[PDB]
Design a protein around this motif. Structure first.
Motif, short mmCIF file in Angstrom:
data_model
loop_
_atom_site.label_atom_id
_atom_site.label_comp_id
_atom_site.label_asym_id
_atom_site.label_seq_id
_atom_site.Cartn_x
_atom_site.Cartn_y
_atom_site.Cartn_z
N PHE B 88 0.81 -1.20 0.00
CA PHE B 88 0.00 0.00 0.00
C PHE B 88 0.85 1.26 0.00
O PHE B 88 0.48 2.25 -0.65
CB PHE B 88 -0.86 0.00 1.26
CG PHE B 88 -2.04 -0.93 1.22
CD1 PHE B 88 -1.87 -2.29 1.04
CD2 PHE B 88 -3.31 -0.46 1.44
CE1 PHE B 88 -2.94 -3.13 1.03
CE2 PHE B 88 -4.39 -1.31 1.43
CZ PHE B 88 -4.20 -2.64 1.23
N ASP B 89 2.07 1.18 0.53
CA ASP B 89 2.98 2.31 0.36
C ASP B 89 3.44 2.40 -1.08
O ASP B 89 3.68 3.50 -1.59
CB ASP B 89 4.14 2.22 1.38
CG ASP B 89 5.42 1.46 0.91
OD1 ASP B 89 5.72 1.16 -0.26
OD2 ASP B 89 6.20 1.14 1.83
N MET B 90 3.64 1.26 -1.73
CA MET B 90 4.04 1.25 -3.13
C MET B 90 2.95 1.86 -4.00
O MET B 90 3.24 2.57 -4.97
CB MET B 90 4.34 -0.18 -3.58
CG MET B 90 5.05 -0.28 -4.92
SD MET B 90 5.09 -1.98 -5.52
CE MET B 90 5.33 -1.74 -7.27
N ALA B 91 1.69 1.61 -3.65
CA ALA B 91 0.60 2.23 -4.39
C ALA B 91 0.65 3.73 -4.21
O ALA B 91 0.43 4.49 -5.16
CB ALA B 91 -0.74 1.68 -3.92
N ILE B 92 0.95 4.18 -3.00
CA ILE B 92 1.09 5.62 -2.78
C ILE B 92 2.28 6.18 -3.55
O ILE B 92 2.22 7.27 -4.14
CB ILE B 92 1.19 5.89 -1.27
CG1 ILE B 92 -0.21 6.11 -0.70
CG2 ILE B 92 2.12 7.08 -0.93
CD1 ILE B 92 -0.99 4.84 -0.53
N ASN B 93 3.40 5.46 -3.52
CA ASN B 93 4.59 5.87 -4.22
C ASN B 93 4.41 5.79 -5.73
O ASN B 93 5.24 6.34 -6.46
CB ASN B 93 5.76 5.02 -3.77
CG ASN B 93 6.48 5.62 -2.58
OD1 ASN B 93 6.46 5.06 -1.48
ND2 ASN B 93 7.11 6.77 -2.78
N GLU B 94 3.35 5.15 -6.18
CA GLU B 94 2.86 5.25 -7.55
C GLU B 94 1.96 6.47 -7.71
O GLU B 94 1.97 7.13 -8.75
CB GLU B 94 2.09 3.99 -7.93
CG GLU B 94 1.88 3.82 -9.42
CD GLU B 94 0.74 4.65 -10.01
OE1 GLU B 94 0.75 4.88 -11.23
OE2 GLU B 94 -0.14 5.10 -9.25
N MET B 95 1.14 6.74 -6.70
CA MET B 95 0.23 7.87 -6.78
C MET B 95 0.96 9.18 -6.92
O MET B 95 0.39 10.14 -7.45
CB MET B 95 -0.67 7.89 -5.56
CG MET B 95 -1.54 9.12 -5.48
SD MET B 95 -2.98 8.91 -4.43
CE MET B 95 -4.03 7.91 -5.48
#
Ligand SMILES: Nc1ncnc2c1ncn2[C@@H]1O[C@H](COP(=O)(O)OP(=O)(O)OP(=O)(O)O)[C@@H](O)[C@H]1O
Lengths: 601, 272
Positions: B88-95
């Motif tokens: 979920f941090d990776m998704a943010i770091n994609e966002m």
DNA sequence: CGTTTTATTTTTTTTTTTAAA
């Protein structure tokens, strides 16, 4: 010698042929019901008792070691699946290990368990599952206990099984694996908690009953280790009886401090037994006053004190307005020295009142009845280790002769006047401890026996701060009465020529029946209709005028009105009708008036 | 279907499900559920404004919004939570790139705050690797204790000055370090490396639900490298965290081990 | 295909506590 196998046949016959028609209602399968409860994934522990196998045969009444039978039956029914996927953590986690693809204990999933004291506990008791009752001591807490972890090889892949029984251990190294065998391809060893099996674990010391210990003896304790399901199954100072095993303790380690064959034994657990159902019979009886008739028969007359107590037995007044609580506990005070047998009623209440206590006039100084501190350079730091007054929540701690303990002793007890608040800036806190104890004060008059010249607080030497915290203050004196002591005498002597005092005036109520009937009472939270609010505030003023019309009289706190409010709604708990009404407070005021107007006339 | 042998969890499912959830996001409280409430954009995109424009890193964020979305995400996050949370941090770091592609994308975030407890008095084998949050009053004010992460080596001839970080505890030894011609034997030194901070202070539970005549029973846990003296110690505070366990060194003559395991909680966040 | 494992007691200063005509 005996076969541990043909008995497997015997028990297969036992459990298979188990719908034992001794009564209307047993042709169904009893342990088949428990079987399917295993198939319900619900029961993780079954139970054995003397009657069960006693009818079956008479061997095993003295064969069952208690040890080999358990692993045998466990494996026996483990391989018994006559009977859904995601029910447990680990249970489905094996399926996760099988998505690409054991001892039955590693899939444990269930368990079973099954007139002497430690003093009598003769030292030929090893292995035998026996019965003893004691008192708990030194309450402790519970942690997980491994049984067998899964030390995977990673490069090899072989979830190793280290099933253990000891209490100490040693690691498992890199690989006892097939591909990690002489075939050179290997990694290292390392567990996986998720797939590992551990077990709850509660331990506490057990002290003696104190009613057996001979003239020249000193009580001693044993240790209790109850693991798995039965954890959290007794508090400190519960008089409890345990059936389990005596088992020695292979304290391995050093080779000269041990090596004596030391045998520092310990105990294994099964159970913590501690010595509506009534509703139909509660329908049989509908009465309010008969409690006094069968509670404490040992003295005739002086019902008024007793009913005043039974109110405190009653309870049922509390509210949390403004965010803040209100004290819903009654605290009587007692002056007098006649022969009353305050010791009598104290023992009576402390027996029947579950969760009871007792202290005396100097036995507990201010730190003992509350929490306290200690000193030792051998065990670590020290704690509060609260006292009887600390412990007696949901109940009463009964001080005797609080007048004579000490003046400053009134302080900390006065702190608990505002309930559930035991402040301590001693162990680096402002701690609370929840002092939720009803309080019983009983003392004797000062020099003399209520000398009529020396008036209240002229004859008494007690600061107002504690009388204000006390709902009721009661002086008991009965001067020479030609007729009075007669009845009381023959009454006493009745249980001297006999054993049970009161004949043919009421049905006596046993401790069980008394407590159960009281058990049905307090959850009414009854109705006090609105006309009382205007009415009662008027009646209270009737007091405050006849308080002021004499100038050498008692002071008053807001708790006088708060008390006369507090008592009435309680008694409706034992009326059991949610209907606080006129009589609900007319008895309140009645008994208040009887508390007074008794020493001049 | 790509998974740890002993589990049922995967990165891509939770990642995509949460990225859709944050795309199913306008402040679902204040724009989908509490439509009577209103701050109308996915708040995390709004924050990537109000974080980047704020230039004020180390966000704080809950996940109790996720009850509306597919609850399987909730569960496998509840149970396998050190292996989905970085996703979920990776998704943010994609966002990041949804709102600013060419940022200074060199910093990370901090972070739950949703699940229940009743009390600390009694827990169970089931409750081993699971999400918990409990509260009380603090007792102490500790010091710091750091923790290592890597080995910085040396050499004898021609400066075979090798280096390598740690999985958690080993470095290997062929005859030289990263076996480079073995002009000399293996080398190691332990300072010019990565270290990590923590402390320890305990809590006293202090609710109105404290059982009758019972003592204080109290809990404790470390910190992580940003969660370190957030704390004027000693007051009414909640924590989140993950129940942790540890075996114990029996005795102390040698490598024997205990049967009983000590426990504490993983170190995440606090509440005011 | 061989040759070796393992122990500590009394006094201080603080904060607790406790004594007699
Ligand atoms: N009417 C009575 N009913 C029951 N017991 C009585 C009655 N009269 C006398 N007795 C007995 O006489 C004994 C008197 O000694 P007792 O234990 O009463 O001291 P006490 O009154 O509690 O002393 P103090 O009041 O000074 O503390 C009691 O144990 C009680 O059993």
């Amino acid at each position: 010698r005996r076969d541990y196998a043909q008995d497997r046949e015997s028990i297969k016959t036992f459990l298979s042929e188990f719908c034992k028609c001794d009564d209307d209602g047993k042709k169904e399968f009893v342990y088949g019901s428990q079987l399917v409860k295993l198939a319900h994934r619900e029961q993780v522990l079954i139970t054995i008792d003397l009657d069960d196998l006693a009818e079956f045969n008479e061997s095993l009444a003295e064969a069952v070691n208690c040890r080999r039978y358990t692993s045998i039956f466990s494996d026996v029914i483990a391989e018994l699946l006559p009977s859904v996927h995601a029910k447990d953590a680990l249970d489905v986690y094996i399926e996760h290990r099988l998505m690409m693809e054991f001892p039955s204990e590693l899939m444990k999933r269930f368990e079973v368990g099954f007139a002497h004291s430690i003093r009598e506990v003769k030292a030929q008791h090893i292995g035998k599952l026996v019965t003893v009752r004691g008192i708990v001591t030194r309450c402790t807490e519970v942690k997980p206990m491994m049984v067998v972890a899964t030390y995977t090889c990673d490069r090899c892949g072989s979830e190793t099984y280290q099933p253990v029984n000891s209490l100490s251990f040693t690691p498992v190294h890199d690989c006892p694996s097939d591909d990690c065998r002489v075939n050179k391809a290997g990694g290292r060893l390392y567990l996986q908690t998720r797939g590992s099996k551990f077990v709850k674990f509660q331990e506490v010391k057990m002290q003696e009953h104190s009613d057996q210990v001979p003239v020249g003896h000193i009580p001693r304790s044993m240790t209790i280790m109850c693991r798995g399901e039965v954890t959290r199954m007794a508090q400190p100072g519960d008089h409890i009886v345990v059936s389990g095993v005596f088992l020695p303790l292979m304290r391995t380690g050093f080779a000269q401090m041990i090596q004596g064959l030391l045998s520092e034994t310990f105990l294994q657990a099964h159970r913590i037994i501690c010595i509506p159902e009534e509703l139909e019979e509660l329908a049989q009886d509908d009465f309010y006053e008969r409690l006094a008739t069968s509670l404490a028969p040992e003295i005739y007359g002086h019902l008024d004190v007793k009913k005043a107590l039974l109110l405190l037995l009653v309870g049922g007044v509390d509210k949390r307005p403004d965010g803040m609580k209100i004290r819903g506990n009654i605290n009587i005070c007692l002056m007098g020295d006649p022969g009353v047998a305050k010791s009598q009623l104290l023992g009576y209440i402390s027996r029947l009142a579950v969760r009871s206590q007792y202290t005396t006039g100097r036995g507990s100084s201010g730190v003992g009845l509350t929490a306290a501190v200690m000193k030792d350079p051998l065990t670590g730091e020290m704690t509060l280790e609260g006292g009887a007054l600390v412990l007696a929540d949901q109940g009463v701690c009964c001080i005797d002769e609080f007048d004579k303990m000490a003046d400053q002793d009134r302080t900390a007890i006065h702190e608990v006047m505002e309930q559930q608040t035991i402040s301590i800036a001693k162990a680096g806190i402002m701690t609370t401890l929840n002092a939720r104890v009803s309080i019983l004060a009983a003392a004797n008059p000062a020099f003399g026996r209520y000398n009529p010249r020396r008036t209240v607080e002229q004859n008494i030497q007690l600061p107002a701060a504690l009388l204000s915290r006390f709902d009721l203050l009661w002086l008991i004196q009965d001067k020479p009465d030609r007729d009075n002591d007669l009845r009381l005498a023959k009454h006493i002597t009745y249980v001297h020529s006999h054993s049970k005092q009161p004949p043919t005036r009421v049905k006596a109520l046993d401790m069980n029946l008394m407590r159960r009937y009281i058990n049905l009472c307090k959850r009414k939270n009854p109705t006090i209709p609105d006309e009382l609010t205007d009415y009662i505030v008027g009646a209270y003023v009737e007091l405050r005028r006849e308080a002021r019309n004499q100038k050498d009289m008692t002071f008053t706190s807001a708790r006088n009105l708060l008390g006369i409010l507090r008592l009435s709604t309680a008694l409706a708990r034992l009326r059991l009708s949610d209907s606080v009404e006129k009589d609900d407070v007319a008895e309140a005021l009645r008994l208040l008036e009887m508390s007074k107007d008794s020493l001049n006339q | 279907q790509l998974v740890v042998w002993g589990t049922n969890v995967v990165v891509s499912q939770c990642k995509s499900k949460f990225k859709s959830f944050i795309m199913r996001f306008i402040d679902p409280s204040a724009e989908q559920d509490e439509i009577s409430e209103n701050i109308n954009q996915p708040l995390y995109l709004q924050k990537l404004e109000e974080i980047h424009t704020l230039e004020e890193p180390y966000l704080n964020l809950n996940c109790a919004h996720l009850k509306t979305f597919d609850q399987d995400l909730y569960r496998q996050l509840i149970c396998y939570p050190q292996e989905v949370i970085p996703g979920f941090d990776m998704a943010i770091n994609e966002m990041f790139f949804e709102r600013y592609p060419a940022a200074l994308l060199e910093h990370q975030i901090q972070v739950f705050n949703a699940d229940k407890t009743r009390n600390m008095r009694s827990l169970n084998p089931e409750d081993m690797d699971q999400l918990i949050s409990i509260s009380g009053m603090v007792i102490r004010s500790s010091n710091v204790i750091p923790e290592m992460r890597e080995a910085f080596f040396s050499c004898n001839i021609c400066s075979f000055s090798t280096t390598v970080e740690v999985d958690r505890g080993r470095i290997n030894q062929p005859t030289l370090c990263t076996n480079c011609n073995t002009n000399h034997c293996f080398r190691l030194i332990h300072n010019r490396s990565e270290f990590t901070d923590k402390q320890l202070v305990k809590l006293q539970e202090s609710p109105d639900d404290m059982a009758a005549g019972q003592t204080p029973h109290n809990v404790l846990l470390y910190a992580h490298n940003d969660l370190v003296d957030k704390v004027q110690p000693g007051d009414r505070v909640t924590v989140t965290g993950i129940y942790r366990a540890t075996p114990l060194k029996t005795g102390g003559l040698s490598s024997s081990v205990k049967s009983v395991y000590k426990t504490h909680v993983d170190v995440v966040h606090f509440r005011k």
